[PDB]
Design a protein around this ligand. Structure first.
Ligand SMILES: O=C(O)C1=C[C@@H](OP(=O)(O)O)[C@@H](O)[C@H](O)C1
Length: 427
């Protein structure tokens, strides 16, 4: 078991040029592969999740080239739905934003493809999406547990009236939105009830428009899509820096700054996680916005009680930052933390208690009362990049912390520890 021990960080200050957004990167790659023309993506993220999508495209016959640092990708569009037969197996690690979009996209036309991934991916739900794809005509088979990957996709999605449950993951709707335009018939996607992680739907619509397609959004309750469309290369496209990855650095400043500036995202970003900065501001930190940066300067840190459904990923960062806040912090309406890289509510509560906090693990919320002083702990990371990055913040105290399997951060941020070290100061 590899591990990394972080010595206490007296102060953080500096600037971080953010790695590319994972959400934008994987959407851009799939749309570029489906589009007509050559797309040049810059500031693309090089991480496991993106590497799995790239490997999937390679397996499906898509041609592309990568720069030496793998952040520039020149993709030759396929000019239409991707195809493969013979139950070709695509291994997608634990990349939700590869698995969900591909599950839908590969239902166009005929195909015989199997999507699978790491053990945990076979435990992350996909039934809501499969249900919707089938209503549209797709033939999909669960090869193991009903409602979960692996899936054997044999095509047939033609369009029509499709209902989709949006209460567990917005990724299902995202997958349908990206796929429907290329279907032969018009599609009306009706959301059954609530829609969680709504801001990610906006990311999806933004990317689709960049690639030439627009749809009719009726207050997020129903989406009217015209079929028979084609995605078109936007030429050169700049992938925004990752706002979720930025949360760690901004929070570090709110806790132990100094001023930390992250570049690659700014006030105009399409990512919902830039709203994480608003939370730090509510806690007492000072935030500065620029066109291509967001900075946070230490002020004070007070506990908050907020619905975090709009920033589920970056919200985890507030859970460990809560260790340094005055009072008890409560993060609500975050049930789907349970069906992600790991069950994050169980994982976060378990590890927070190890460093001394009193924690109520609610069914869909978490309440954290910090200790007078933190204690040393060896943190388990549950093959979850964010557990490693969230707990790295424990070192912004008088105690070191040991993080197990630090390389799990490579899911979205391979250089995480070197970047945190860059802003870590002794004086
Ligand atoms: O669409 C996306 O890029 C993502 C949406 C979120 O999933 P849910 O919709 O299930 O919350 C998020 O947690 C995931 O890391 C990426």
């Amino acid at each position: 078991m590899e591990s990394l021990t972080l010595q206490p960080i007296a102060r953080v200050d500096g600037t971080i040029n953010l790695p590319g957004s994972k959400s934008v990167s994987n959407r851009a790659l799939l749309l570029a592969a489906l589009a007509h023309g050559k797309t040049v993506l810059t500031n693309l993220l090089d991480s496991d999740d993106v590497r799995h999508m790239l490997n999937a495209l390679t397996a499906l016959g898509v041609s592309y080239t990568l720069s030496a640092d793998r952040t520039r990708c020149e993709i030759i569009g396929n000019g239409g739905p991707l195809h493969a037969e013979g139950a070709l197996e695509l291994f997608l690690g634990n990349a939700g934003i590869a698995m969900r979009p591909l599950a839908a996209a590969l239902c166009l036309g005929s195909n015989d493809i199997v999507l699978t991934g790491e053990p945990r991916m076979k435990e992350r739900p996909i039934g809501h999406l499969v249900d919707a794809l089938r209503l549209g005509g797709a033939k999909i088979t669960y090869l193991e547990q009903e409602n979960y990957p692996p899936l054997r996709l044999q095509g047939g999605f033609t369009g029509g009236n499709v209902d989709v449950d949006g209460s567990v993951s917005s990724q299902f709707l995202t997958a349908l939105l990206m796929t429907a335009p290329l279907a032969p018939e018009d599609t009306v996607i009706r959301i059954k009830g609530d829609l969680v992680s709504k801001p990610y739907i906006d990311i999806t619509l933004n990317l689709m428009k960049t690639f030439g397609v627009e749809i009719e959004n009726q207050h997020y309750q129903q989406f009217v899509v015209k079929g028979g469309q084609s995605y078109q290369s936007p030429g050169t496209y700049l992938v925004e820096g990752d706002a979720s990855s930025a949360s760690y650095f901004l929070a570090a400043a709110a806790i132990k700054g100094g001023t930390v500036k992250v570049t690659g995202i700014g006030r105009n970003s399409m990512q919902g996680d830039i709203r994480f900065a608003d939370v730090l501001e509510k806690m007492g930190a000072t935030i500065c916005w620029g066109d291509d940066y967001i900075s946070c300067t230490r002020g004070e840190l007070n506990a908050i009680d907020m619905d975090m459904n709009h920033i589920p990923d970056a919200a985890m960062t507030i859970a460990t930052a809560a260790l340094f806040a005055k009072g008890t912090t409560t993060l609500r309406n975050i049930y789907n933390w349970r069906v992600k890289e790991t069950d994050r509510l169980f994982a976060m509560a378990t590890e927070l208690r190890k460093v001394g906090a009193e924690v109520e693990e609610g069914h869909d919320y978490i309440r954290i009362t910090p200790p007078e002083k933190l204690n040393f702990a060896e943190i388990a990371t549950y093959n979850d990049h964010r557990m490693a990055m969230c707990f790295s913040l424990v070192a912004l105290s008088d105690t070191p912390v040991t993080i197990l399997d630090p390389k799990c951060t490579a899911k979205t941020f391979p250089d995480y520890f070197e970047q945190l070290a860059r802003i870590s100061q002794a004086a």
